[PDB]
Each structure stands twice: as structure tokens, then as C-alpha cells.
Design an enzyme around this catalytic site. Structure first.
Site, PDB file in Angstrom:
ATOM      1  N   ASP A  68      -2.948  -5.908  -1.378  1.00  0.00           N
ATOM      2  CA  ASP A  68      -3.204  -4.536  -0.963  1.00  0.00           C
ATOM      3  C   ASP A  68      -3.505  -4.353   0.511  1.00  0.00           C
ATOM      4  O   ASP A  68      -2.910  -3.477   1.151  1.00  0.00           O
ATOM      5  CB  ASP A  68      -4.348  -4.005  -1.812  1.00  0.00           C
ATOM      6  CG  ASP A  68      -3.934  -3.741  -3.252  1.00  0.00           C
ATOM      7  OD1 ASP A  68      -2.791  -3.969  -3.633  1.00  0.00           O
ATOM      8  OD2 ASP A  68      -4.765  -3.257  -3.993  1.00  0.00           O
ATOM      9  N   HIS A  91       4.853  -6.204  -1.403  1.00  0.00           N
ATOM     10  CA  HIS A  91       3.732  -5.873  -2.261  1.00  0.00           C
ATOM     11  C   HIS A  91       4.070  -6.006  -3.750  1.00  0.00           C
ATOM     12  O   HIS A  91       3.262  -6.508  -4.525  1.00  0.00           O
ATOM     13  CB  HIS A  91       3.325  -4.482  -1.870  1.00  0.00           C
ATOM     14  CG  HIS A  91       2.149  -3.986  -2.653  1.00  0.00           C
ATOM     15  ND1 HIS A  91       2.203  -3.097  -3.635  1.00  0.00           N
ATOM     16  CD2 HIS A  91       0.854  -4.383  -2.441  1.00  0.00           C
ATOM     17  CE1 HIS A  91       0.977  -2.931  -4.030  1.00  0.00           C
ATOM     18  NE2 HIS A  91       0.166  -3.691  -3.311  1.00  0.00           N
TER      19      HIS A  91
END
Ligand SMILES: [Ca+2]
Ligand SMILES: [Ca+2]
Lengths: 122, 122
Positions: free
Chosen positions: A89, A47
């Protein structure tokens, strides 16, 4: 935006995102160094790398369009930069769910001094 | 686990592990850079490289299964990652014992800026 990301983590894991994930391991907080401590933390590492790749809009502070279709998160809208953020996300929140089996409470507010220097490359 | 590593070191060298080994040379402390200053420090360098090759578990916090058999440490258990960690610790414990004859008190808490720039590779 950070609060949309938090919505997706709460929905995907049932865990309240802040105490459970905002400080986990070596990568889930602001920054990150060393080697990812386990798979949850490695989700946070991907991420962070996913955010570093975004040129054109602010990953943490801009909003994107997403909706929930038949049990899954669908990133939309017509701005390709924002949808790119949404995909980072969504991918992280699914990864957290898949690694809920190895989630260690001992890593929940992990001491930054224990993270190696040698940081893994993206 | 770190504590198990420390017990093996006390038992093999007779020295109390922290004071004598936790800050020795360029590699016995956290991190490490430069080239090994001597043979004890090279024990520490191989051990840093040994931990770098381990994925699947956490060298510092996971406790492994080991026992002594006739003045020899024997690593066991059925979890392969943890046995690797055990094996990394046993080898360094033996390596510090075998190099007690060149252990220089001058390198006991060696300032890391004194360590050379091009780090050696694993
Ligand atoms: Ca991070
Ligand atoms: Ca070291």
C-alpha cells in the site's frame, strides 16, 4: 485495510482516492487485464501483483499498524503478513505521487473493453 | 489515433474501413488468435504485433503528426512513440491496399471460434 490504503493515497496525492484512482486504467479497479495504460496504472499493476503474493492474511480487508514519521509512512506491528500488506500500500501510494505528472483524466473511469487480452505477467 | 488509421485505410483502399476491415479474419478485430487466414489478415496480425511493441504512448487514443507527400503517407512529429504508432498504421494501410486482390468477403465477419488454437508468434 482498504480504508488505510485510501488514507495514504489522499495524503500522498491530495486527490480523493475513490473517483481519482478506484477505476483508473486497466488495473486500478477490482481485477485487471491487459497491458497497463501508463505509469499510474502500472503502479496499480505492481500493487495487484504485490497482493497476489500475500499468504496468511487478507490484504484488502485486514488492518495493519502504520504511522507517519517525518513526512514518510512507516509500516510496523509484529505480524509479518500484515506489515507485508502495508508495504504494498505504501509503495503504491508513493508511486501514484511520483506519476502525478502523467495522470490522464481520460483514464479515470476507463472502459474495461479497451484493455487487451494479453495480460502482462508480474 | 484509431480515426487517423481509418482515414489512411479509406484513402489507400477506397473501402470504408469498419465494415470491410474491423472484423476480418482472426486478427483484424480486437484481440486475435490462431493463425492468419490469408494475406489481409496477416496485415492485421503484423499490425497487432506492431502495437504490442509500442510503450510510452497509447496506440488507440494518441493522435500523431502525419501528412501526405506525393501520394505517400509521411509520419513526423518529434515524439518518437507516436511516430512509431503512425508507422504501424501506414504500413497496414499500404498492406491492405496491396492485398485487395485476395480480399475474401467470406472472411469479413469471421466467427472467432473458427480460428485455430496455436496462435502464431510475432
Ligand atoms: Ca486491480
Ligand atoms: Ca487485432
Amino acid at each position: 485495510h482498504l480504508l488505510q490504503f485510501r488514507k495514504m493515497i489522499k495524503k500522498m496525492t491530495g486527490k480523493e482516492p475513490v473517483v481519482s484512482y478506484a477505476f483508473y486504467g486497466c488495473y486500478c479497479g477490482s481485477g485487471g487485464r491487459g497491458k497497463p495504460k501508463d505509469a499510474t496504472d502500472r503502479c496499480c499493476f505492481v500493487h495487484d501483483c504485490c497482493y497476489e503474493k500475500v499468504t496468511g492474511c487478507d490484504p484488502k480487508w485486514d488492518d495493519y499498524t502504520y504511522s507517519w514519521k517525518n513526512g514518510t509512512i512507516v509500516c510496523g506491528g509484529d505480524d509479518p503478513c500484515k506489515k507485508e500488506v502495508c508495504e504494498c500500500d505504501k509503495a503504491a501510494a508513493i508511486c501514484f505521487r511520483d506519476n502525478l505528472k502523467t495522470y490522464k483524466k481520460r483514464y479515470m473511469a476507463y472502459p474495461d473493453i479497451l484493455c487487451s487480452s494479453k495480460s502482462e505477467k508480474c
